[PDB]
Ligand binder design. Structure first.
Ligand SMILES: *[C@@H]1O[C@H](CO)[C@@H](O[C@@H]2O[C@H](C(=O)O)[C@@H](O[C@@H]3O[C@@H](C(=O)O)[C@@H](O[C@@H]4O[C@H](C(=O)O)[C@@H](O)[C@H](O)[C@H]4OS(=O)(=O)O)[C@H](OS(=O)(=O)O)[C@H]3O)[C@H](O)[C@H]2O)[C@H](O)[C@H]1O
Ligand SMILES: *[C@@H]1O[C@H](CO)[C@@H](O[C@@H]2O[C@H](C(=O)O)[C@@H](O[C@@H]3O[C@@H](C(=O)O)[C@@H](O[C@@H]4O[C@H](C(=O)O)[C@@H](O)[C@H](O)[C@H]4OS(=O)(=O)O)[C@H](OS(=O)(=O)O)[C@H]3O)[C@H](O)[C@H]2O)[C@H](O)[C@H]1O
Lengths: 48, 179, 48
């Protein structure tokens, strides 16, 4: 979970299924380095 | 622990100091090369110059239709290429800027001929004279008795030499004159 | 944890210089020359 203490709101963002441009108060993860796109396996994995 | 904590931080601090020492020396490296080049070119600007020894021209009918310049190296100058050099022509009509035309009669350009030396475009030695050739009826109209011309021979480095060419008062009974 | 933390701090890449080819009137490549930092170990440039 991610806590967004922003300039206006203050919520706790939870993960949502692959839904970009429609992600309301949720957050989505797209993989950068690795086979998995939601879990960090080894030290070399990078996830956006 | 404090023993473990100190060692990791100490490893970081030498790396930070390495980066800080890195930028300082390299920045001085660029300023070294830029500074040395500026000193050489600025010195070349003041020193490398052209001196005009004398000027003369042909006389046809009753109009000076050539202007010839005898240039020479300035005091202490280095090699003076006469192709990368330019000469301004503020005449009685036109007011253009001549350049080198490799081999000609030259329209709106000047030519060399090498009076003395081992080159016809470079003032390599100190005792070598090169003749700058300028066509009058090509850059403008054929000069008449009294029509003065202002010439500034600009070298590549930037040094300028001004010579005022004054046609004699009367052009009667003479094949050539001394402008 | 002790080994990995020291590896994180020490194993670093140093960039020596950067240059690129230029065609027509636009840089079409950006090349960098890299070297390992002080006291670093083997740095694989594929997991990077
Ligand atoms: C400034 O400096 C320029 C430098 O070029 C100088 O220019 C020359 O001026 C000469 C003269 O007016 O003083 C011009 O001379 C003539 O042309 C020459 C050549 O053809 O270019 C020569 O021509 C031959 O001369 C013979 C001779 O018996 O008179 C004639 O049969 C015929 O005209 C030509 O025959 S040829 O050689 O078989 O072609 C001659 O001059 S010379 O070489 O000095 O003897 C002149 O006719 C010269 O053309 C011109 O570039 C300016 O005068 C200076 O003010
Ligand atoms: C960053 O670093 C990269 C490193 O690759 C660099 O990329 C290269 O840039 C070269 C150039 O633009 O600077 C490119 O060069 C060309 O291709 C080469 C090769 O085929 O890859 C060479 O090819 C030969 O060129 C001859 C020539 O007459 O043109 C041709 O007959 C034919 O295309 C090739 O024949 S061959 O050599 O018998 O195979 C040549 O460059 S060379 O090897 O330096 O002489 C160029 O044609 C290169 O392809 C490219 O990867 C970037 O420029 C940097 O910014």
């Amino acid at each position: 979970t991610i806590q967004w203490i922003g300039p206006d709101x203050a919520t706790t963002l939870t993960y949502x299924x692959x839904x970009x441009x429609x992600x309301x108060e949720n957050f989505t993860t797209x993989s950068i380095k690795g086979x998995x796109x939601x879990v960090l396996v080894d030290q070399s994995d990078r996830i956006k | 622990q404090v023993g473990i904590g100190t060692l990791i931080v100490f490893i970081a601090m030498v790396l930070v100091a390495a980066i800080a020492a890195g930028v300082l020396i390299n920045t001085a490296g660029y300023l070294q090369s830029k500074g040395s080049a500026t000193g050489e070119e600025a010195s070349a600007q003041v020193s490398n110059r052209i001196n005009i020894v004398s000027a003369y021209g042909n006389v046809x009918x009753x109009x000076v239709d050539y202007v010839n310049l005898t240039v020479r190296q300035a005091a202490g100058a280095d090699n003076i290429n006469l192709x990368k050099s330019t000469i301004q022509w503020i005449g009685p009509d036109x007011a253009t800027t001549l350049t080198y035309x490799x081999x000609x009669x030259x329209x709106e350009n000047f030519t060399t001929x090498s009076i003395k030396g081992x080159x016809x475009x470079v003032l390599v030695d100190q005792s070598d004279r090169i003749k700058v050739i300028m066509y009058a009826x090509x850059v403008x109209x054929x000069l008449x008795x009294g029509x003065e011309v202002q010439l500034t021979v600009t070298t590549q480095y930037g040094s300028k030499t001004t010579y005022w060419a004054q046609v004699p008062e009367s052009l009667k009974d003479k094949n050539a004159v001394x402008l």
